[PDB]
A paper describes a structure:
We also produced the NBD of HSPA1A, the structure of which has been determined previously. All five NBDs crystallized in the presence of ADP and either MgCl2 or MnCl2. We conclude that at least HSPA1A, [name], and [name] bound ATP in the expression host, hydrolyzed their bound ATP, and subsequently during crystallization never released the products of ATP hydrolysis into solution.
[name] proteins consist of two major functional domains: an N-terminal nucleotide binding domain (NBD) with [name] activity, and a C-terminal substrate binding domain (SBD).
Author numbering: 4 to 381
Amino acid sequence: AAAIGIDLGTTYSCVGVFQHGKVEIIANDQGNRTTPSYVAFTDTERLIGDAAKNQVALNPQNTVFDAKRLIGRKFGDPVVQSDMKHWPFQVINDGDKPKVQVSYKGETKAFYPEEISSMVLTKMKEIAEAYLGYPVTNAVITVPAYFNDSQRQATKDAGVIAGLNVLRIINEPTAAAIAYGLDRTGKGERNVLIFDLGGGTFDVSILTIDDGIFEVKATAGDTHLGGEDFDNRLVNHFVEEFKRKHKKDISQNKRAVRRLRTACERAKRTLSSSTQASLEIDSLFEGIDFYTSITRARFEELCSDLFRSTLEPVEKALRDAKLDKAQIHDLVLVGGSTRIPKVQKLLQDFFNGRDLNKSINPDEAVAYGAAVQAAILM
Ligand SMILES: Nc1ncnc2c1ncn2[C@@H]1O[C@H](COP(=O)(O)OP(=O)(O)O)[C@@H](O)[C@H]1O
Ligand SMILES: [Mg+2]
């Protein structure tokens, strides 16, 4: 019985297993090595992952996402109230506990955030099981370093609802450090900086590792900065461009904007390894095709202030840990947005030419570390 490592992410989740000496990051049924943290409810079925995200434009009120922003928080919580204003789905109050309310098979039903996340965890569990060819009952699940007891508990519960014995709940930055084998240094304190630019959040952590024991020395960043913000700059740019070429504003067509958003995210992803990208959407708005392109340099310009803003939390965390740039032994890249060449440059330049540990797919580093730790704990 291999136990599994699960990164239960805000925007994407990832599952790994350590067996026969190495970590396998397990692809899902569509061949994707990470899976959106999305759960959809329709007249006839419950969809999770890619199947949920791939119908988001068609079903906005009953496609749930961002459950991680609610998990283990009270309804009265100001982050909750505030985050609520921007979701297309209803959150409601059940004894100061938030529930996401949707319609499923024709009826209004309401779920706790840990219930939604348990459906994502079940999907990651079944992904793992399809590959291993047996049931998985033990898992290590990861959380942000700043998660309080009640968010850790609610995440553990999500695991238990999913039919997993949760061997441990560990910090995301520690799991990334474990992935790179930094946990096995000894006697001396090593200082490690995790730079984590994901889909919805930006986390900088400084850890000190001394004879295998981790200490979180500083944390910083921005809980609303991530790849979604870069998708948006691109969306706004192409909306303006559509207006220029056809004198038509797609702004208010919720469906056109979501399909444009989708095309942008995919274009963006291509710009991490190519210097130009094709954007081709059939019948975007009133039967008008939108066939166009964008360069890495143009996308960089559109995002230049957001990209730069990531170095301020780095300065802050260094200050709060009372360390200079030159006392950081290792720079680890985590999150899919750190595949962006400009971002790697900014961080490497900030650190005066220092290597970045980026050999492990950054959107997988946390799951990789969880999988290593799960095997150890077993
Ligand atoms: N090659 C790439 N270039 C730029 N962004 C990417 C790339 N691959 C994935 N992403 C982005 O990474 C983000 C998801 O990051 P990930 O670490 O998987 O999830 P999470 O933030 O939920 O932990 C998304 O915004 C996605 O578009
Ligand atoms: Mg992440």
